[PDB]
Design a protein around this nucleic acid. Sequence first.
DNA 1: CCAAGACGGATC
DNA 2: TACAAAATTCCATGACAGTACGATCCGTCTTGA
DNA 3: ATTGTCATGGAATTTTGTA
DNA 4: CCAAGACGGATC
DNA 5: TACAAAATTCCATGACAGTACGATCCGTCTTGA
DNA 6: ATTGTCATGGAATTTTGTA
Lengths: 184, 184, 368, 368
Amino acid sequence: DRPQKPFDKFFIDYIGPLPPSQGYLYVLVVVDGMTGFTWLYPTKAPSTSATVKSLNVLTSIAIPKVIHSDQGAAFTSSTFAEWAKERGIHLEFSTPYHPQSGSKVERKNSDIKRLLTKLLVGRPTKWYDLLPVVQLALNNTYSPVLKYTPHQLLFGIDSNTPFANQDTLDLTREEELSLLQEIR
Amino acid sequence: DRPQKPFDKFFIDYIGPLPPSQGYLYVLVVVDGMTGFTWLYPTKAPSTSATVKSLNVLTSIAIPKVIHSDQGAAFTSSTFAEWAKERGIHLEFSTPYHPQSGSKVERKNSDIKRLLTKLLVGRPTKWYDLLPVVQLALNNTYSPVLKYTPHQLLFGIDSNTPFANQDTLDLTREEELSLLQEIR
Amino acid sequence: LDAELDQLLQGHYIKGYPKQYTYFLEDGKVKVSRPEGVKIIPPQSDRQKIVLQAHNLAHTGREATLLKIANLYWWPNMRKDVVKQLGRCQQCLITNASNKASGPILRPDRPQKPFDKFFIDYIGPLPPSQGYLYVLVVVDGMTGFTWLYPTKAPSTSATVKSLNVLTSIAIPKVIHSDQGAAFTSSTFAEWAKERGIHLEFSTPYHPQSGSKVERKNSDIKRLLTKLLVGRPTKWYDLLPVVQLALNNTYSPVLKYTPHQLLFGIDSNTPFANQDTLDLTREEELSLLQEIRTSLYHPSTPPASSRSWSPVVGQLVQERVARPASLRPRWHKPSTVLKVLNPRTVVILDHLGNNRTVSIDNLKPTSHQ
Amino acid sequence: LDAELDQLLQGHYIKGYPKQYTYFLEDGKVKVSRPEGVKIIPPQSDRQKIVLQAHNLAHTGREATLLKIANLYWWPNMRKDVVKQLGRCQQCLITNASNKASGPILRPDRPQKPFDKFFIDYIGPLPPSQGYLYVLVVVDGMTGFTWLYPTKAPSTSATVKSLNVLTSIAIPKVIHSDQGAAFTSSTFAEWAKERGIHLEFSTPYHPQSGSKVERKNSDIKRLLTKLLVGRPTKWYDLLPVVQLALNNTYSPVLKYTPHQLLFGIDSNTPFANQDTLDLTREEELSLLQEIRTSLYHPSTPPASSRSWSPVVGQLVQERVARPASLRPRWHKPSTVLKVLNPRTVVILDHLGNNRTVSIDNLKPTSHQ
DNA sequence: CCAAGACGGATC
DNA sequence: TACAAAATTCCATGACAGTACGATCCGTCTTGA
DNA sequence: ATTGTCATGGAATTTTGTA
DNA sequence: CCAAGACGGATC
DNA sequence: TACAAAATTCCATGACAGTACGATCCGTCTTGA
DNA sequence: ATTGTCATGGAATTTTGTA
Ligand SMILES: [Mg+2]
Ligand SMILES: [Mg+2]
Ligand SMILES: [Mg+2]
Ligand SMILES: [Mg+2]
Ligand SMILES: [Zn+2]
Ligand SMILES: [Zn+2]
């Protein structure tokens, strides 16, 4: 049996309807299976048209062998099935109501969910400009179990911007009250 | 004593008030002392301004050591004296009422006087276009005494257009009656 | 295709495939165990398609295309199938740059007598000086004597009027010029034929063909530049001064001025040479003939290590003159009809007619 | 001047003038009988004027000026007086072309790691495709990986927006670019300083300095040309295809693709290499480090027979970028302040300030 | 007397 | 019949090849309130 | 049916003046 | 249906 | 241990360098009387 | 304060298959 490699499986998912920032509302999250490298793409809608447009910029750099996604309408569409057929990519869909990706992918996806909201509190209309620095933070996060960052696993070298110190990713006392006031 | 050379003496003279041809009325005749090479320049007036303008095109090719001319107002002017002083040319003026140039120069000047009138009879308004072919005819006329044409004495080789046959330069019977009718 | 691979699997030998290697069928496809790795052997019919698929990815050369096919596929004589497809691709032949230099430049014999060859050319649109913009430059092939004529336009009428004053001195045998509109015109063609002058034309888009006038233009511009330092660019009045200057200029390799080569004796020009002062004109012209004949002739430079020589029947491609943005800089393959010299050939062009083109604007068709 | 020539006429010897020749006074001027002919010897004070008079005729070099003076005048060491006047003439120094070639081109060491050096450049104003005209090209110094970004303008804001999507992958150490307005701007300077990126600039009007992006532009244009044969020039949609094609293209001399040098393994691209299929990623990255370090380094070509090398204190002249018609193509003589390498120096320019210029746009001041 | 602008310069 | 230096030759080198114009930003000099 | 050319200015070589 | 013109092509 | 030819390496060669526009004449296709 | 580069495709050299 062959060992796990980069570009083997690409985990794609949308994260909620975020507050408007420069016309954008949705974020397409792309996570590699082996390296755990994260690609973030700003989108206006959770549609197939927005998914195809964002992935075309990604596939111009590197093409995945398998694309993994949930039973979302943007991925289960026939237009997205024809899109993957032209580039020779097999589509893998997780079982409804309960997704399956693995410990490394789910722990990475958990960090993206909380890191975005941590920087979103106080400035909900300014998450678009943070997207580049969020991608750099995730890809240079010192791996919990392994001794290799997503940057080191993909390229082979250490990054020029290594994130040495870590904030606990948790919301502080007064940050919780401000986050509970923005909704109500 | 040094032998006679080209560019030693340039004999310049105007020939009459010829019928209007493309706005021009006068011809500046330039004859070299040794070679007998003829330069013809069309001018509107027998003035210093027209003489300076025509000779500037000639002096750009070759500069004479001595310029010979009659006691005409265009040559005896102070403006023409300053013109020759700047280029370093000595001016020689012939005695009034009787010019002196030599047998070779006067026989050449005699041919220009009669060759122009020969082609002028019948077409007095079209002598401007004949000027190039008149210059070629004179400079390639087989010398009466010497065995060298003005072209052969100046360049060293025979011309590409050698005038083999000669018309007697004389006006025919009916050409005399037409020439005597143009005036009266 | 299927018969050659079937006999190979059962142990029977076919020329091309070595017997030492093991051949096995896997996933419905014939594979071979090689030092590089496990490679798939395709049938003969599919080989033509695979090379086309790997080439059309980035339109690459011999080695760069093979390295893509070597990732998965192997068969006897791979490059012979690649090179064959490289000569078939129309897009590659008319875009790729040639890796073969042109042959050694010819140095034609200097005209024997003055007024044997006349080189004429305009020096572009110069800054407006007294209404004039263009300068007609006439260079003698033998002596190097230059006549300058200011013109407002590079037209036929401007060329005729200027040459008519010049032909008053002497009629030239042959007038050489580039394929400009003023010189290629029928009015200029009938002008030269009337006086018995043969017209010679340079090969299109090859300015070094008429170099005797082009190199002189460098000396005219260089002198005009130096005279207009810190001054407004008025060159019209300086033309008769520049004409007199360059004609009396000593050539360090020729030892004689264009004026001295044309007449034999210097005029009343500043710093005039008076060495032939004692001798008569008849002796001066006899010495002049000996000088003209005994001038140096530049020997042809040695041929480069990778140079191509044109032959009759060879496929060549003509260079596109002024190619548009993202457009091919070479024309469709064409056959050589006749070779005039190792530098000039006549070819049946893309339009479908006879055309005289120099080898500098030509490349040999690759993969033949 | 008058004392040296007076003692010479009466038989007394002066150094420079040979005693074997006869010296006589004629027409109030000192003359000498020589094998060339009768030549006039002028006084020392007049010699400076005569050389100036003969030179200013056509502004000629050493030999061509002397041959004019040799027609009439003679004195000891004529060329030493000519060369001295040749270095004094301002018009000749800033117009004449240099007869000395530049030194051998340096081949700088390839960046050690990926994202160590970034080469960026726009490919001019391409024909309008979906509103876009310009293409920002980012080339990695180590691998040769190219990122293409379509832009409507060569502005700072267009460069920042395109690089912000790129820097999401990895932050580069040093970004190299030509001295374009978008890159030399203070907004772009504060952009790179904010992320901790050093900006490197090419020497003005020397495009080969940033060759890694300029040579890649040739491969981009060549591929786009072939894909648009017989088709309207719509390149906007082909950019992501061209980007994927050239990055997966095998370099025949490097044996590896820009994609293989950056990641180690080929993606799901057509004709993917699967040689490292058996080895693990940790073993694959260990092999990748050995490949990157053991790549060929092009050796520097031998120096030409007549090449000049810049030194501190030497007088040099800077080349005029885009000279106007009939205007000098060289600047006033300037002194070298510091030599960075045998190809690049810092000079106090015509304006009167420090300027880093490559030797290709520089010539050594003649007659020193 | 100062804020938005006009304009040649530098480089591609 | 040998020097040293002037004088002369050698020869690699580059420029002539229809050119002016736009687009960007920056440092500097305007023009009405 | 046509084709490179030549000024330039350091270096390389030859000539020159006086033994 | 034809005379002055309009227009892209070729080359500088 | 030696062939012949395939396979591989060698390496001179050119193009990337912001580009489009005008001016001339000629061969060809219009547009009103 | 910074620096030429590399695809191309014939020729030159090395490797290969089978003695
Ligand atoms: Mg989702
Ligand atoms: Mg008179
Ligand atoms: Mg022309
Ligand atoms: Mg640029
Ligand atoms: Zn191709
Ligand atoms: Zn000068």
